[PDB]
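re: that complex we talked abt at group meeting.

here r the seqs, copy pasted straight from the sheet so there may be weird spacing, ignore it
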Amino acid sequence: MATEEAIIRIPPYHYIHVLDQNSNVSRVEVGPKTYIRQDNERVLFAPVRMVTVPPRHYCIVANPVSRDTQSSVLFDITGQVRLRHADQEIRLAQDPFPLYPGEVLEKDITPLQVVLPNTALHLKALLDFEDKNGDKVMAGDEWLFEGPGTYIPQKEVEVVEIIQATVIKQNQALRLRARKECFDREGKGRVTGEEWLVRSVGAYLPAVFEEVLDLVDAVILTEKTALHLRALQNFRDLRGVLHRTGEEWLVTVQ
Amino acid sequence: MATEEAIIRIPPYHYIHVLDQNSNVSRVEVGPKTYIRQDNERVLFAPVRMVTVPPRHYCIVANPVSRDTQSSVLFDITGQVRLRHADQEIRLAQDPFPLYPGEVLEKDITPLQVVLPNTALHLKALLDFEDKNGDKVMAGDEWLFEGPGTYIPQKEVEVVEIIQATVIKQNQALRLRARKECFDREGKGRVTGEEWLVRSVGAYLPAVFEEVLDLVDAVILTEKTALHLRALQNFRDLRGVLHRTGEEWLVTVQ
Amino acid sequence: MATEEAIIRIPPYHYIHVLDQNSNVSRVEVGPKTYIRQDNERVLFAPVRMV
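got the structure back, here u go
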């Protein structure tokens, strides 16, 4: 049922064979095994399936522009005996090992990285529970990423990156419409659909928050000015004074 | 009555045979058995039925985009001995076992998820009596789903998801048309067609409740205002005062 | 280098195969082995010589 593949094949190039003949026993998940190699394909078996592949790489161009794929877990160690054709895998520069037969759902993502005010990352869990350092994740909820580098492009789909809000003290303050049961990332106060005030200078929008609008104060250290305000919910102002809706006050150099 | 199917067939591909020849005795519900497999289909029997199939899979692409089907329970354990062609099944990634002969009612549903205020799930029982953990459902009534994860798309047809209502305190409160003998899902009072008021902030319409309108309050902490009211049923107000229909009172900074 | 010799063959009849592939070790002088037999010649190896 086939011919001797005694063909010349170049060193970085790829070729898929014995896809038709039997595969291994036990947990050794070598299915129909194949080879990417330098030499002439001398073929000891004619029954073997022949798949015409000229150009292919296993090259991860430095750490930038890296790759992912369907796990083809053929080699293992004394610690990680991973599920082969059940899981999906992600790759860095540290993988210049040659290609396999059971690979699907893959491309080449460039590892984008961002730091502090620069930008943030709005990850979630597409099906993940506990894939990252030092503890465990709960359902399909969402995390914040602020500071230096990047991470694994796996088991999380990021909502987006967020270009944060920037606040120049006295002239500015930030409004933040809480969106879920959202606990305040900056204090104990929280309620869905509610409104927020940022008194800190140039800070970031936590995943649950939302930059509504940036609101500039009216300057009233002036003996020649006072503010006319209408309390809109029952509360205490910045200066801690009991206030009921509709009530009207004027604020002035206190 | 047929030919030797000695044909080459790829590892994840599927083929249907012996659909014409006799089936098993006793509870072993193997009918005309078939095989999805890696190797060459050597067929020791010519009488066999040949169902021409190139591309197929048992691929449940991670937990998302998963699949269900008409049951085919050939392998069982000690804890489970199932009816194979009466029932109907639902499947996740945790089942990459091959295909069968009795497959009829199936597709590729992505197990959509929603959590907290975000959205709700208006589940009903299409035929079901007790399909879910730690107890037993009464006929084809309706539940709600609120918080973290998803579940089994099986014995329950969902009415819809429900993008909930949202109320901002003193400015707002909700109206809810109770539609069944509906017991109040936030209190004790109840009656069909009746009218409700939501006094909590940003919440969710339970299954029997219906979002009518959200009603904003008139600001009357004003010394220059009072509200003219007309009691439409015999009752006691927010402030717990005896009222009768027709009756008119005015409400002012109390 | 050849085809699956899945052919029908009669009981007293004869056929010569695996003439091309390797032969045995030691004093067991089976070279390119063959078979005369009753059944259908299912051939697990395609490289086999067909006579």
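couple things i noticed - DSSP finds no helices and twelve strands in chain A. The CA atoms of residues 229 and 249 of chain A lie 5 Å apart.
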